[PDB]
Design a binder for these strands. Structure first.
Ligand SMILES: *C(=O)c1cnc2ccccc2n1
Ligand SMILES: *C(=O)c1cnc2ccccc2n1
Ligand SMILES: *C(=O)c1cnc2ccccc2n1
Ligand SMILES: *C(=O)c1cnc2ccccc2n1
Ligand SMILES: [Mn+2]
Ligand SMILES: [Mn+2]
Ligand SMILES: [Mn+2]
Lengths: 8, 8
DNA sequence: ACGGCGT
DNA sequence: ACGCCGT
């Protein structure tokens, strides 16, 4: 759920 | 995650 | 269920 | 010269 590199 | 030049 | 960078 | 995540 976090998007810091993927944003799932 | 660090932004020293890119800031991802 | 997910992965990324440039000055 | 630089490292981080939650629904
Ligand atoms: C988002 O909150 C989140 C939390 N845990 C994960 C585990 C694996 C893939 C993606 C995830 N996203
Ligand atoms: C994004 O691509 C990504 C990859 N690895 C991580 C590890 C810990 C927190 C955030 C991250 N983001
Ligand atoms: C941020 O903490 C971070 C860590 N590792 C990376 C590797 C590749 C591109 C971006 C990154 N960001
Ligand atoms: C920013 O553009 C950038 C490029 N290369 C690096 C290498 C090591 C630490 C920080 C960096 N920042
Ligand atoms: Mn990964
Ligand atoms: Mn580079
Ligand atoms: Mn977590």
């Amino acid at each position: 759920x976090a998007x810091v590199x993927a944003x799932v």
